[PDB]
Design a protein around this ligand. Structure first.
Ligand SMILES: CC(=O)N[C@@H](CCC(=O)O)C(=O)O
Ligand SMILES: CC(=O)N[C@@H](CCC(=O)O)C(=O)O
Ligand SMILES: CC(=O)N[C@@H](CCC(=O)O)C(=O)O
Ligand SMILES: CC(=O)N[C@@H](CCC(=O)O)C(=O)O
Ligand SMILES: CC(=O)N[C@@H](CCC(=O)O)C(=O)O
Ligand SMILES: CC(=O)N[C@@H](CCC(=O)O)C(=O)O
Ligand SMILES: NC(=[NH2+])NCCC[C@H](N)C(=O)O
Ligand SMILES: NC(=[NH2+])NCCC[C@H](N)C(=O)O
Ligand SMILES: NC(=[NH2+])NCCC[C@H](N)C(=O)O
Ligand SMILES: NC(=[NH2+])NCCC[C@H](N)C(=O)O
Ligand SMILES: NC(=[NH2+])NCCC[C@H](N)C(=O)O
Ligand SMILES: NC(=[NH2+])NCCC[C@H](N)C(=O)O
Ligand SMILES: [K+]
Ligand SMILES: [K+]
Lengths: 282, 282, 282, 282, 282, 282
């Protein structure tokens, strides 16, 4: 009863003072979109951050929808190898599913509870200018971010709108490219000198094995990739968080999307429920 | 030859003065979107409107792109008789082709010439609130406009952005509805009391016994649907035109979208090249 | 653990949205200044309301300090009866203790935790214009509020300062008058169309005997004074709350000052911990 | 023809974009001030410049009206030698025709076609601070420019007014000095860092053996005054042009004041109708 | 003496408070324009009015300089009858002395003592729109005032400039009309709803049999023109005074242009040195 | 007599111009607060400064009022030798007489004449942060200024309020300290880099062999404390004056507070009536 209330609020409220007016870039990866209750709490968390004066910016990935469409549209995966190739027709379907399907569902859910969210993509006012990714050879319209023009995002958050961004970039050649969501969300936070970058994943956070490491610095994060503690798909995430932070972002939080109110618990408590990467005061 | 340059300018410059800062809602139909040459001159015209200080707003349709998706997807039409029926799955493909492909091609083009266009749709910040169009029975997720919330538009145009709108509204329930681009375009123009509403068709304008009618008062226009001179799809148009004019829109122009620079010739010349409907005045 | 956090925050946060930017007038009566821990929590509550965007305004009464000074200064209570008389020399000592002693201690405590509080009184920019109270005959410089000039309060809260007001008013004759704190705090909230008026007392709130009545309307409050449920010193308080509310104040909360974080618990929970008086929506 | 309208506009509209808000200083010479149809066109071009968002500033000359005023006043054009002379009696008359007669003739016309013109001279607010001319002994009160105070001009054009300026300078001793309009116009231009200075002469411009010279640069222009292409009174002008260009002015234009609508053709077409002097930088 | 300073200031400083930011229109008549020491004082008072925060506007007359210009130009003051006449030739000369000579003499002086003066006439921005005078047959181009457009004046005084206005009116036909300075000054006053109109005459003001009249009201003043106290040319002036007062002007002042520092003494002392006409309202 | 009125105004008006919008920190001592007649003329002067557009700030002392409270309270002095000692209880009575009585009498007076005064003290929003003055040993809660936080002052004067400051600062610990009004007044003036710092004393100014010294540069002033010409309490003053001037204060004036209208005579006359210390200049 009562005391739980006092202590939660005394722990929380301060954070309302510090984050009021700041920008949080939140990456909707896989997980937090699977189980229904986790999906509901998430939508709710965003609305709360908005009630407290925070400017949330959402970034989402692809998923089931894309593989399905490709099949239902009788199209097979093409490879050069380092991976799958993305030919014109495939890019058109990806952009169609991401923008016309996933992006707008999130916008509907949010606008169903007061979020005033408007969906857009890298093409809009050239938010994300991209270029051909060539490390594995010409494998299609796979891109790397060349520049971020955040004016549109400032115009939106400045008028109380929550951007919902689909990872599709525009190249000078006018063509469109697919972009890794984590990277796009990180590049978008760097260009805004955003307070936080929140990456939702399928785990509690970085585990120094059997245990969750609550805090880390960019240097301590890399060291764990070098000494082999960090492996799998978790490597590219942490590597993304390290870059974001060294690029001007206040802090990056890696947390479990399958955890109900993971976002609410990570931001309004002092201990959190995931891993936070950040430079020391110094 | 000098003589020409002088005459065209003495006649255009005055319009640049009176239209500065004004808003023009333009409905982009099928013809001007079909021939690369009318389409190239169209983008060119929006850009010139922007350079003269006019605030354009674009609302586009769909057509071929949608049907093709239907066929490539094995989705079979359904009747609940009165006509076609936008069902659950049909809507999703419509929303996906309008938002994810058509909308973004227009945004790309404009942004390839300094238009600073951002493409949204009826769902974003609930710009277009719709409810199931019940007159022709239960034909599915076909809707009529309950209300237009123009805030996002104002935010975008005041910040020098060109909104490219997809005709898909949202219902209080939360389901997306397909709306007639002409009505949509006419409704938002009313909501903003725009200076002009421009409808690009495939015909020169409103014809009577093979003769283009230059001018029309709303009344004269009702007596042409009444008189039987206006028929077929042109009825819904003239209908929107009259509604728009009485609702506060300065004037609506029904011109031939297949005519190169139709917009330029209609706006910056005294006689015009199509039909303009407006009240009497001094 | 956890869930307590989620439910407290989900119950609280909404209120941050509604009260942000609003003004709360808080009356520091007797009680909440007695036991030390209650005094500490109170100071803390004010700072929190400030962290959340609320504009608190404090009003305090007299107490032990005044009786003491009168004795230490060898002065005896004079009566005409309806009460104690307030002769020039007595008024001078009251104003000295209230302004020079009580008022500034509160300011120090607050400014010890970030409150940016500045103490002032009814004399300042003629905040409280008063006049001779004559219902019991000329008994000295006892006053009734004749007018409130809240400009000074707007200048302060508008610049992030928390006013701490001592109940001393100025009369046109230039002389100063003592004013009942509850009345002054109520008159000050009315003149500001303040969202809330919070009266701290020595009880849980209005008790329909053995039980605490959580909510009431101005009419239901008076009825309880007529039917004799409300008696004692609690009559003038409720009567004060009724007036304030009928004068334009969002709502008045009567709560226990001896209760730790009474303010925090009353404003960030839906049930509260005292009595709230307010007109119905209608 | 519809192709003339398209072409003329596709050329002009872009200049409209880049000249919007800029300032043009224009020297109203003797030529265009003569033939009723050359004069009509000029007053019109000035207005159209205003309609497109440009801020025009006009500097006029004298000559005829003055000479006739000397002689009518029983005074014969006095000399001493180096040219004429402007003794105290001759000056006062000069200032009377330039400011009292001519300057008002120009304002009276513009203001019959919505010009919002207000005439002033170098004395008003000490716009043009001049010093007794020395390079030619003591030729009366003829003077040179020592300082320009555009404050008044700025104030005027920011309020949608068109400054019609008379070449009379004011000296530190309150005294008046006659000044060369072209050089006054060129000095005020530099003083504003205007976008353009237009000098209207009695001939197409700089003729390279009959053949007219379209564009040049400061360094080139001086070379034609050296080899002897620029002869006669076309030398004085070409220099101001240079002076101003190096003084910060965007570009200078020497056109046929006689050529009806010379201004219009020179500014909104890419080839102009006269000689343009400017620096190199695409 | 120290008591003189105290008294003079305790009187003046209050007027400084209430005249701060207000507008005063002042008619520079023939009197104060004559004796080098009367003239010196005037230019000084105007500056001091500016130093205290008042916005002065000056309207000058002509007379002498003109008459000498008629005759020097071989033209004798023509008549027909009802008084003089101002045929086309006579007007142009008039406009030349009022605007070209006189108006600049006043600006040249103020601007030697930090006045920031800029001279203009009724033509500039169509300040004074006049109609051919009719009450006296056809006496040339003498005219009456039909409309004032203070826009220019406002623009000027808001930028810390002092308008020096010449009485020449501009008619709907672009033509020029001579106008009575006093009435021009009174019309512009009403047009601005100025705080004061100062008419400088050739005598202390309105003399009630030698004895000077301090204050009056509109209704009273007219009565002295009826019984015959106000005789001679002191009738025309007194009327403008009335006209303006009823026209909205705060008050009017008729003082001795001859009296050195008349303005200063009349405005900062409670008794004034001349006759003041105004409405009743403490 | 006219002759006087003119001379006083030609000499005062110029000062009204240069002091408009400037800030004057005035230290109100014992003399001007002792005689009802100097005190009446003092309030009158602050009001006139306000009416001329100057932003006065008042810092007052104490003296008699405090001692009397001491005696009427049976509080006995204490020495920790070097001099008197402000102990726990002594401070509380000092704070109570300065804040609760003296401060409020000045606020009342001013507000009785339109001064819109609000009285604060060093504690309010930590305007004056002090630490125990350790030079003369441990004499109690006597303090020296560690820092001045002028925000509240800026808020008050920008909103047309006259701050009446009590010389009681606050220490980081939280204990209140007694500070020298002269230093306090000199410190805040430095913090605001006020135009003037005015010290009202009981002597005409800085004297040398019975002669008042009109002007002084900081250097000339140090050589008078050094030379032995300045003695006693005047040392701390001249000391503050020099410090203030070098710290950014435009000039400090040391005048006789017992002289009626000392402030008026010093500010609005060229010669002044006391001593003005300022750097050399042009
Ligand atoms: C991997 C990454 O950057 N993004 C995810 C987002 C979708 C998800 O988590 O399922 C992706 O697959 O592209
Ligand atoms: C029908 C109508 O109102 N609009 C068209 C626009 C598409 C086009 O021109 O191809 C539509 O299909 O919705
Ligand atoms: C009664 C009331 O209005 N105020 C209280 C405030 C002090 C307190 O509660 O002790 C008072 O005694 O004047
Ligand atoms: C002052 C001056 O040089 N004036 C020139 C203006 C006309 C011109 O150059 O064509 C003049 O004829 O008197
Ligand atoms: C135009 C006009 O009436 N002028 C007057 C101005 C001087 C005056 O009235 O003293 C004139 O003498 O010509
Ligand atoms: C001493 C000094 O600096 N100030 C005086 C001011 C009081 C007065 O003039 O009576 C003081 O006692 O603190
Ligand atoms: N995993 C962690 N270390 N979490 C700490 C979170 C701290 C705080 N709520 C923030 O948002 O910064
Ligand atoms: N169809 C017409 N008759 N059009 C007339 C066009 C008038 C003007 N150019 C305009 O855009 O308003
Ligand atoms: N006693 C009560 N009824 N309390 C309800 C409080 C509700 C809410 N927290 C408010 O501040 O309005
Ligand atoms: N003579 C010329 N070079 N004319 C070209 C001028 C082109 C265009 N009017 C401009 O101001 O830039
Ligand atoms: N003749 C007079 N009545 N003069 C009184 C003028 C007083 C003061 N100068 C004012 O403008 O109000
Ligand atoms: N003591 C002096 N000599 N004072 C000169 C005063 C100068 C001017 N009046 C001022 O206030 O700055
Ligand atoms: K633009
Ligand atoms: K004021």
């Amino acid at each position: 009863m009562r005391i739980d209330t006092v202590n939660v609020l005394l722990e929380a409220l301060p954070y309302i003072k510090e984050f009021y007016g700041k920008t949080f870039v939140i990456k909707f990866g896989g997980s937090a979109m699977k189980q229904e209750n986790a999906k509901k709490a998430f939508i709710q968390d965003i609305i709360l951050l908005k009630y407290t004066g925070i400017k949330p910016i959402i970034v989402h990935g692809g998923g089931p929808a894309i593989s399905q469409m490709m099949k239902d549209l009788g199209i097979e995966p093409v490879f050069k190898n380092g991976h799958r190739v993305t030919d014109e027709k495939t890019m058109e379907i990806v952009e169609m599913v991401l923008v016309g399907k996933i992006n707008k569902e999130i916008v509907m859910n949010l606008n169903l509870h007061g979020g005033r969210a408007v969906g857009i993509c890298g093409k809009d006012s050239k938010l994300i200018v991209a270029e051909k990714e060539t490390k594995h050879g010409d494998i299609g319209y796979v891109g790397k971010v060349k520049k971020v023009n955040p004016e549109i995002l400032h115009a939106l958050i400045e008028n109380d709108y929550i951007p919902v961004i689909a990872p599709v970039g525009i190249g000078e050649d006018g063509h469109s490219y697919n972009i890794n969501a984590d990277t796009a969300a990180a590049e978008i936070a760097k260009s805004l000198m955003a307070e936080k970058l929140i990456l939702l994943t399928d785990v509690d956070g970085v585990l120094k094995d059997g245990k969750l490491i609550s805090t880390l610095t960019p240097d301590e994060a890399e060291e764990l990739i070098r000494d082999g503690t960090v492996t799998g798909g978790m490597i590219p995430k942490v590597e993304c968080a390290v870059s974001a932070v060294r690029g001007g972002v206040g802090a990056v939080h890696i947390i479990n999307g399958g955890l109900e109110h993971a976002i609410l618990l990570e931001i309004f408590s002092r201990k959190g429920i995931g891993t936070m990467i950040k430079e020391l005061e110094g």
